[PDB]
Structures are given as C-alpha cells and as structure tokens.
Scaffold this active site. Structure first.
Site, PDB file in Angstrom:
ATOM      1  N   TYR A 137       0.961  -1.163  -0.011  1.00 48.22           N
ATOM      2  CA  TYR A 137      -0.073   0.090   0.007  1.00 48.22           C
ATOM      3  C   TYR A 137       0.765   1.162   0.168  1.00 48.22           C
ATOM      4  CZ  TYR A 137      -4.092   3.050   1.167  1.00 48.22           C
ATOM      5  OH  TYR A 137      -5.138   4.013   1.373  1.00 48.22           O
ATOM      6  N   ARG A 188      -6.284   3.046   3.846  1.00 48.50           N
ATOM      7  CA  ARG A 188      -7.099   1.695   3.611  1.00 48.50           C
ATOM      8  C   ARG A 188      -6.446   0.625   4.128  1.00 48.50           C
ATOM      9  NH1 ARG A 188      -9.774   4.865  -1.174  1.00 48.50           N
ATOM     10  NH2 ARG A 188     -12.004   4.590  -0.748  1.00 48.50           N
ATOM     11  N   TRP A 207     -10.731  12.115  -1.979  1.00 54.33           N
ATOM     12  CA  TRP A 207      -9.432  12.318  -1.702  1.00 54.33           C
ATOM     13  C   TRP A 207      -8.521  12.612  -2.889  1.00 54.33           C
ATOM     14  CZ3 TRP A 207      -9.036  12.277   3.272  1.00 54.33           C
ATOM     15  CH2 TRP A 207     -10.101  11.673   4.137  1.00 54.33           C
TER      16      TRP A 207
END
Ligand SMILES: NCc1ccc2ccccc2c1-c1ccc(C(=O)NCCN2CCOCC2)cc1
Ligand SMILES: N[C@@H](CCC(=O)N[C@@H](CS)C(=O)NCC(=O)O)C(=O)O
Ligand SMILES: N[C@@H](CCC(=O)N[C@@H](CS)C(=O)NCC(=O)O)C(=O)O
Ligand SMILES: [Mg+2]
Lengths: 200, 199
Positions: free
Chosen positions: B8, B14, B104
């Site tokens: 990530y 997340r 975002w």
C-alpha cells in the site's frame, strides 16, 4: 430456528436485490416490503443509521445490504467453500459495490447528472469490465467451481449498468455468458420472471 | 504461519485496519509501502488496479475489508455469534461508505475543499450521533468485547479528527472508545512504532 424475515426497501431492485436473490436461491420465506416515498420520513426516523435496505430478523433490525447478504449466506453453498474462497467472494463483491457507489444517484440535474454518469460509464466501466473478465480467466464462475453470491452480485450490478450503457459487454462475451448462467439457475430464473418490473 | 506481504502507499489509509489486525494477532508480515514514483508502473500488476493487496504464499488478495474479515475469522476480533458478525460487517461498511465519500483524489482544490467541508460539517455530525446512540453505554460497539469494528472506528475517526478536531466534542463515549482501542497493548505498540503520516 427459521426466523421471520421482513425486508424493507424502495420499490426497485437496487441495493435490496442481492438479498432477494439469496432468499430465492435458498427458498426462504420473507416479506418483501416496498415502501413509498410518502412513508419514508417516518420509517427513516426509526432506523439506527437512517438508510435502507434493512432486514428485520424476528424484530431485530439489521442494516447494510452486503453485511446482510453475507449473514444470510453464512454456512451455505453461496459463501465460498474455503476461508480463502470466502475472501475472494467478499473482494469481488466490494469491487463491484465500490464502482456502483461511485455514481451520484441522488443528482436531480439531468444534464450534470448525466455527465458524472457519462464519464463513469464511458471512461471507467470498460476498464472494470476488462479486469472482471481477466479475473474470471475463462472459468465458469467468478470464484471456485460453483456459483457464489459474488456471481449473483455481478449479474445484479451489470444489469443496472446495462440499463444506462447497453454496449457494456460488447467486448466481453464471457461476461455475458456468466450473466446468462446466473439467470438460468432455477431459483434465480423463477425470481427474475416474478419480481416487480422496475427500471432500477 | 504464512508469508504475508502487504502492499500500500506510505499512509495509514485503507491498509491500516489490516495492520492493526496483524499487530493484535502478533502475526509477522512485510509492511510494503510503495514509492509514488513507481505507482503508475506497479499499478498494472494489481488485480483491479487498486491497493492494498495482500500476498499470502504466492497468492494475491485484494480489498481491505475483505482481507481484514479473512484475517479475523476464527479469532477473538470476530463477532461471537453469526448475528454479531453481521453487526460488525454493517458498522464497518457504514464507516467505509462515509470515508469513501471524500474526494481524496480531487485535483480541483476549491471543489475538493467545498466537498470536504460539506461532508465534515453537515454529514459527519449525523454519523457521529448515530454511532454514539448505537454504542449506548456499552463497552464496545458489538457484543461484550473488542472486535475489528472498534479498530475501524478508531482508524476512521483518527483521520476525520485531522480535518475536524472538534468532531467528538459532544460525544465523550466515542472518545472513550477510541482511547480503549488505543490502550490495547499490541495496538498501542503499533501506534507507537508506525510511520508518522498525515493520512
Ligand atoms: N487515514 C486516511 C483514511 C482513513 C480511513 C479511510 C476509510 C476508507 C477509505 C479511505 C480512508 C482513508 C484514506 C485513504 C487514502 C487517501 C488518499 O489516497 N489520499 C491522497 C491525497 N493526496 C493529497 C495530495 O494530493 C494528491 C492526493 C486518503 C484517505
Ligand atoms: N452501503 C449501504 C448504503 C445504504 C444506502 O445509502 N441506502 C440509500 C438508498 S439506496 C438510502 O437509505 N438513502 C436514502 C436516505 O438516506 O434518506 C447499503 O448497501 O445498504
Ligand atoms: N474499497 C477498496 C478501495 C481500494 C482503493 O480505491 N485504493 C486506492 C488507493 S487509496 C487506489 O488503489 N487507487 C489508485 C488508483 O486507482 O490508481 C479497498 O478498501 O481496498
Ligand atoms: Mg463497501
């Protein structure tokens, strides 16, 4: 013990449909409560999070369409056979939901609505269809060797997208085949022929 | 244990729910944070062009909550009854639905700022109210002990508080829940050692 199930949603397939497919597949009796905008203010005010669908199980109110769907498929042949397969099923389901949730469904400005919608359908949907086809990889079902509720959700979500973009799967015959396969499952076929005909 | 590799961006975002779970369960994993440089490149490998993904012995899994649910199955972070499990899933999707509403990625700054402000000043308080009422005077959101829904509440609220510090002024019980999650030893240790990022 087989509980009393009451599903509350608007008169449309929408977010309640995955639950209705599961009930049909498992031959589970339930009350398909479709409300009118008129009664919504009142119903809305009594719900812990103010959104539908909700499913009342012996009077206890459950919310979130996919949380409910997963609950109903636990311990059934629709969940995925292994813990890992269940993860794959949950993943495809959220990938489809993520996309469907990108559309600004509230929008009243027919034009500017049809612009956010138009961008998503023209520029993004084809990319997702490609990835879904790639994921299926020539196999019969999205996950494992038999149908799961991810396949049900694929058919449901694609049906909605097809309403706005009829050429959605023109480059994906295998995705069309999977839709037909789901639609052919006896219990699902029976639900599709009998359900109220609504646009969405 | 399996060889786990989480991929990530260098942010909580997340992937954080997965990171909390691994910490709480004391499961070793490779915390792989990619470079904004190799992003447009590495993208073409992901199942659906999205992160996080979790590699488990040569097999790739995607979707943060799908992975989180998988990792918590058969553990004390899962609901204790099938029904509690549904409550856990529902609270998590209610939180995720709201966080997902934020643009975002919006490049248009005035637009992004209008939308952030709208969500935080208008919609956010309603959600805080609903969550507070849902919790009531109970110890945790679901059942009698901590579940990954409590983790997610602490994770999502931490980020909302960055943009709206007074969000929980009328919700002391939700503050208490945040603190209870932060006080779990393994979680506290992770919060102390993780990379310090805005998001
Ligand atoms: N901690 C953040 C957080 C917390 C809970 C969540 C829950 C669901 C979904 C997302 C989240 C998230 C969450 C996840 C990702 C991003 C993100 O990718 N933003 C990048 C912003 N950059 C700013 C500079 O310009 C380029 C873009 C923001 C918030
Ligand atoms: N992710 C949720 C979303 C629930 C949701 O946003 N439902 C809409 C109807 S499709 C709603 O209740 N909005 C109407 C309102 O907020 O008054 C779910 O799948 O159940
Ligand atoms: N619901 C998904 C969303 C995944 C997601 O949208 N991730 C973003 C990063 S925060 C992403 O990979 N997007 C970058 C891109 O589309 O190029 C999940 O929780 O894993
Ligand atoms: Mg979701």
């Amino acid at each position: 013990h087989m509980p009393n199930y009451k599903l509350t949603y608007f008169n449309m397939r929408g977010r309640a449909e995955i639950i209705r497919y599961i009930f049909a597949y498992l031959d589970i009796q339930y009350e398909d409560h479709r409300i009118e905008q008129a009664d919504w203010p009142e119903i809305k005010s009594t719900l812990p999070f103010g959104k539908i669908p909700i499913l009342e199980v012996d009077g206890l109110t459950l919310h979130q369409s996919l949380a409910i769907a997963r609950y109903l498929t636990k311990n059934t042949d629709l969940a995925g056979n292994t813990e890992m397969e269940q993860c794959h099923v949950d993943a495809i389901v959220d990938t489809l939901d993520d996309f469907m949730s990108c559309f600004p469904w509230a929008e009243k400005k027919q034009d500017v609505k049809e612009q956010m919608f138009n961008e998503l359908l023209t520029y993004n949907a084809p990319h997702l269809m490609q990835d879904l086809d790639t994921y299926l990889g020539g196999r019969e079902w999205l996950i494992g060797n038999s149908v799961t509720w991810a396949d049900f959700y694929w058919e449901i979500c694609s049906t909605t997208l097809l309403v706005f973009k009829p050429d959605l799967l023109d480059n994906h015959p295998r995705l069309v085949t999977l839709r037909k396969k789901v639609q052919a499952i006896p219990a699902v076929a029976n639900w599709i022929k009998r359900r109220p005909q609504t646009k969405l």
